[PDB]
A and B are shown apart, each in its own frame.
With several copies, the nearest count.
Chain A
Amino acid sequence: KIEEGKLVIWINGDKGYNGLAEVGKKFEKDTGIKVTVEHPDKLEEKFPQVAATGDGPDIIFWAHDRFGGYAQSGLLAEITPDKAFQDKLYPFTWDAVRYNGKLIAYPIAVEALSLIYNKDLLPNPPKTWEEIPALDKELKAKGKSALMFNLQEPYFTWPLIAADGGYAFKYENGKYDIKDVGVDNAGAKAGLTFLVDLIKNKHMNADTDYSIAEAAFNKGETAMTINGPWAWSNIDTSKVNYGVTVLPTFKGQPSKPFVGVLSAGINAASPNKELAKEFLENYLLTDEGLEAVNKDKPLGAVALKSYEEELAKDPRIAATMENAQKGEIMPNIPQMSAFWYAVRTAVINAASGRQTVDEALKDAQTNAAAEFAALLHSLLEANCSLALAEELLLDPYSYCNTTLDQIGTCWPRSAAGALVERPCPEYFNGVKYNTTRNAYRECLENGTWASKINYSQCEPILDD
């Protein structure tokens, strides 16, 4: 239940949420409709939890990579702008919010990571990752360090892992191939091995997080950091004479960051869909709208043609685009959650020494590619064909033919008109279920299976 007659918006704490709230005061002044902008932590996780139920915010802001995942779960309303409004944003930002032909969010801006550096401590930043160790040794002797950045989020280490051949999902023949993950190839190993060595050799600390790295850089304690445009604002405020530049190379190869499009989706269950559409279309994605948010935290390259024209003239925005050109735009597929979770674990376990690189990236391999699920599926496929073999052997135009459905339940050859029941699945997509209860499917009088399967009785097994 969302309160009808208001707008509740969720956006991440590192973005210009105060700028956004002022745009909210513009709307309210004009229409009399209150706009509440909130920044809950774990935003990208807390959403599908609430939105699933029919609750949460009217609008959500996050990079497009997680939006496939919401659309599949059916939590995003289908946005409906016309030709005239789409001609005002760049076509490639529209690609990022298209899942299965449908636009599911408004693109706001393009984010890419850059190398930010202190010009006073380092007038000439390193062009290669490999010279950073020596550079840290010199800086240590002055009671500083070379490089601090967030080691807790795979987003910041990915550029280095991708550099020499690391990838998420293979892109072939139009589609992303969810069964071909490149998190365990020689390139990924080499990039991750390099990071882990910086830590063993005490050029970095495995605990270092977003706030540790930001504060150190803005106090002048470290020469370099890795971050995006939202961070520039805090550096302006600080003493620091900073430059924003292209990322270092690894094995002569450019670092390949994942490029995200900040996006505004609309909660499917909200009764305020049109109000939200009028706020995003007529208030936020205007120059006045975007400027208000940007003058709080920079957005990067915005999705609006009329405002980027100006913004493109900033050399910091040039650098953001240079790095963007060298990376990939993120896939928006639902398997992105699982990939990110997998790589987050690898980097942390590898960094802490809990696991070696080889061990770590293989687990991530198996997790990202859902190989346990793919193995179990092969077993169920085989079992289901056999049960059909057994029956045919023991043996007319009136049966429903055997199927294996998306959950792994084998529906046997059945009589027209039969209500069939089968044990709930023993395992499904990470979760175990009480198999003492059944699912139910009707074989219709016409010899075709009913389209819908009753899975209502299948309950998970959890704590105690």
Chain B
Amino acid sequence: NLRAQAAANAHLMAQI
């Protein structure tokens, strides 16, 4: 839900 959402952002944040 919002845990998988946070996880998706964290990986985008890591790349950026």
Contacts and interface: CB of A to CB of B under 8 A. Distances in A.
Interface of A: 45, 48-49, 52, 73-74, 405-407, 428-431, 452-453, 455-456, 458, 460, 462
A462 B2 contact: yes
A453 B16 CA distance: 6
Contact of B3 (A428, A452, A462): A462
Contacts of A430: 2, 5, 9
B9 A406 contact: no
B16 A428 contact: no
A337 to B, nearest CB: 9
A455 B14 CA distance: 7
Contact of A405 (B5, B8, B16): B16
A52 B13 contact: no
B8 A452 contact: no
A407 B5 CA distance: 14
Given A429-B5, A430-B5, A73 B11 contact: yes
Contacts of A452: 16
A452 B14 CA distance: 9
A73 B16 contact: no
**Main DSSP-derived SS at the B contact region:** helix
A49 B16 contact: no
A455 B13 contact: yes
B12 to A, nearest CB: 8
A48 B10 CA distance: 12
B11 A52 contact: yes
Contacts of B13: 407, 455-456, 458
B8 A73 contact: yes
15 contacts: A48-B8, A52-B8, A73-B8, A407-B12, A429-B5, A429-B8, A430-B2, A431-B6, A452-B16, A455-B13, A455-B14, A456-B13, A456-B14, A460-B6, A462-B2
B7 A52 contact: yes
A431 B16 contact: no
Given A407-B16, A431-B5, A462-B2, 11 more contacts: A45-B4, A48-B7, A48-B8, A73-B11, A406-B16, A429-B12, A431-B2, A431-B6, A456-B13, A458-B13, A460-B9
Contacts of A462: 2-3, 6
Contacts of B9: 428-431, 460
Given A430-B2, A462-B2, A74 B11 contact: yes
Interface residues of B, number: 15
Contacts of B16: 405-407, 452-453, 455
**Main DSSP-derived SS at the A contact region:** loop
A405 B15 CA distance: 13
A309 B16 CA distance: 47
Contacts of B14: 455-456
Residue with the greatest number of chain A CB neighbours at <10 A, chosen from B2, B6, B13: B13
A429 B9 CA distance: 7
Which 9 residue pairs are nearest across A and B when measured between Cβ atoms?
A455-B13, A460-B6, A430-B5, A431-B6, A431-B5, A429-B9, A49-B4, A52-B11, A453-B16
Nearest to A72: B12
A118 to B, nearest CB: 39
Contacts of A48: 4, 7-8
A194 B11 CA distance: 42
B15 A74 contact: yes
Contacts of A456: 13-14
Contacts of B5: 429-431
Nearest to B4: A49
A341 B3 CA distance: 16
Contacts of A431: 2, 5-6, 9
A52 B15 CA distance: 12
A440 to B, nearest CB: 12
A455 B16 CA distance: 8
Contacts of A52: 7-8, 11
A73 B16 CA distance: 12
Nearest to A428: B9
Nearest to A334: B8
Nearest to A455: B13
A120 B9 CA distance: 53
Contacts of B3: 462
A52 B7 CA distance: 8
A57 to B, nearest CB: 17
Nearest to A429: B9
